[PDB]
Amino acid sequence: GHMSKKELAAQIAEKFTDVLSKTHAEEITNFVFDHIKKALVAGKEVSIAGFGKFAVTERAARDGRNPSTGETIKIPASKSAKFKAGKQLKTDLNN
Amino acid sequence: GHMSKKELAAQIAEKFTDVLSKTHAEEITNFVFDHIKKALVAGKEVSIAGFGKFAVTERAARDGRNPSTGETIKIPASKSAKFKAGKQLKTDLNN
């Protein structure tokens, strides 16, 4: 199955029937995924109670001659977000 | 640094002040995450354009007891999920 955020933004318009319309609930859903991001560059662990918590990790930068292939390397460091699953995705999801 | 679902609730309530209120907007904010939890149940490839992607995983079983606290380790063979990061939460989180 494919699933994209318009599928999420449609749903909440369809169930909060008289306050969210699909045309506005697209923006409402935008600010979900925007603000996670603005938090995660600010220094923060974004906790979503029952669901899990997203925090940052850093990869080390690597330099040298790769000793399998002999190719020289100049790979820099970088940060990324990662995730730790909670009960909604454990015992609520598992039957 | 730390961030809750309560501040995701305040965020949209700032934008649409007369139709969304920070306690009301908690439930709107929760039902996004409830509809992604529902999707990873059947096994849908939840791929949020720019944010990243959500798919299944199987938990690996572990039967044991931590001697250093006295707690049982009692992981079954269970359904869970996992995130794979996309461009907003790696490449442009990263500077």
Identify the residue among B24, B27, B28, B47 best suited for mutation to test binding to A, counting A beta carbons within 10 A and taking the highest: B28
Rounded to the nearest 5°, which phi and psi values hold at B83? -110, 145
Tell me the pairing of strands B79-85 and B45-48. Answer: unpaired
Dig out the tokens for A1 from the structure: 């199955």
What's the number of domains chain A is made of?
1
Domain that holds residue B21: 1-95
Residue A30's CB: how many other CB atoms inside 10 A?
Answer: 14
A16 Cβ partners below 8 Å, 6+ apart? A25, B27, B28, B31
Question: In angstroms, rounded to a whole number, what is the distance separating the alpha carbons of residues A16 and A1?
Answer: 25
A2:B83 CB<8 A = no
Contacts B2 to A, Cβ<8 Å: 44-45, 47
Q: Per DSSP, what are the bridge partners of residue A56?
A: A81
- CA angle B70–B75–B76, rounded 5-degree value: 145
Residue A41 forms contact with B (CB below 8 Å)? yes
DSSP B29-93: HHHHHHHHHTHHHHT-EEEETTTEEEEEEEPPPEEEE-TTT-PEEEE-S-EEEEEEE-GGGTTTT
CA distance B69 to chain A (A): 22
Method used to obtain the model: NMR
- CA angle B89–A54–B27, rounded 5-degree value: 105
Q: Which B positions 68-87 lie with beta carbon below 8 A of chain A?
A: 78-83, 85
Q: What is the CATH number of the domain that holds A88?
A: 4.10.520.10
Question: In angstroms, rounded to a whole number, what is the distance separating the alpha carbons of residues B41 and B55?
Answer: 10
Question: In angstroms, rounded to a whole number, what is the distance separating the alpha carbons of residues B68 and B88?
Answer: 40
> Any idea which residue has 């979503």 for tokens?
A48
Identify the residue among B21, B94, B95 best suited for mutation to test binding to A, counting A beta carbons within 10 A and taking the highest: B94
Contacts A37 to B, Cβ<8 Å: 51, 88-89, 93
Residue A45 forms contact with B (CB below 8 Å)? yes
